Amino acid sequence: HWGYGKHNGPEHWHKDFPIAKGERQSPVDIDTHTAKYDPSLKPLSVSYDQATSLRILNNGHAFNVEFDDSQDKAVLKGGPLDGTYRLIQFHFHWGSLDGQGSEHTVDKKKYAAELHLVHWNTKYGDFGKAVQQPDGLAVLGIFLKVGSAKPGLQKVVDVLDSIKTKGKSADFTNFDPRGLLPESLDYWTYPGSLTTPPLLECVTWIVLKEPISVSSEQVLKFRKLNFNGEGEPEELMVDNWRPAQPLKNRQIKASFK
């Protein structure tokens, strides 16, 4: 099975998922001097007031916090998007050391972790149909740097003990994702893909310029999770990030100057 090890990591994915060598793969390095300011880009509209979280799960690759997407409760609009995108889940990617962990990079700089808030285009009816479309998903990416603690993240950190291994899930209701957002919503955007298999090229990436700060103790807790299931040899869940892919014939746009 695919993973992040030496024998099943990113360099091997192309054997089972040939699209790994495709034309619009993610993540990428964001060269701040070549990105172009596009004044036609609208500000992002994040409406998370009615978000209903349901559960937190360790799927063997990361931990996901899932939301009820049966209605337009928590949605993302505006920016480079056309239509309404519903929040379905969020997860993180992190490193074994503070100097690595993020998937996207900024002028080759790596952050300690990267948060992905995944949304799907409602015009396609269901998430499964959305992933088969070029504009089916919108993922909001937020960088994490180590510094002061992020209070809104603590409730997540505190429940990780209950989902240490692959397959474990815990009820996780009434969590407000607004607590994870930076002050500014300035962003870069480009067309890309999922960063894990199936690596489908159905994502409009929206990467925020402003990183959020989390404490050393908060990120340390992420690193205590396991890739393995209960009863199996312990493999710490760290470095679950894909390296930067070629930009090819794509242009990264910025909402700011």
Ligand X SMILES: CCN[C@H]1C[C@H](C)S(=O)(=O)c2sc(S(N)(=O)=O)cc21
Chain residues binding ligand X by CB under 6 A are 59, 61, 89, 116, 118, 131, 139, 194-196
Does 242 participate in binding Zn ion (rule CB under 5 A)? Answer: no
Report d(CA 222, CA 32) in Å as an integer.
Answer: 29
- Which is closer to Zn ion, CB of 100 or CB of 256? 100
- Active site includes 14? no
User: Residue 195 annotated as binding?
Assistant: yes
Q: Which of residues 77-136 bind Zn ion (CB under 5 A)?
A: 116
Catalytic residue among 1, 61, 104, 119: 61
User: Residue 196 annotated as binding?
Assistant: yes
Smallest CA-to-CA distance from 159 within 167, 170, 147, 145 is with: 170
- Which is closer to Zn ion, CB of 42 or CB of 91? 91
Measured CA to CA in angstroms, residue 168 lies from 56, 66, 152, 161, 218 at distances of: 9, 14, 23, 10, 20
CB of 214 to ligand X, least distance (A): 19
Report d(CA 241, CA 102) in Å as an integer.
Answer: 7
Smallest CA-to-CA distance from 94 within 244, 227, 237, 243 is with: 237
Report d(CA 41, CA 254) in Å as an integer.
Answer: 8
Binding site for Zn ion (CB under 5 A): 116
Binding site, annotated residues: 91, 93, 116, 195-196
Binding site, annotated residues for substrate: 195-196
The residues annotated with a catalytic role in the active site are: 61
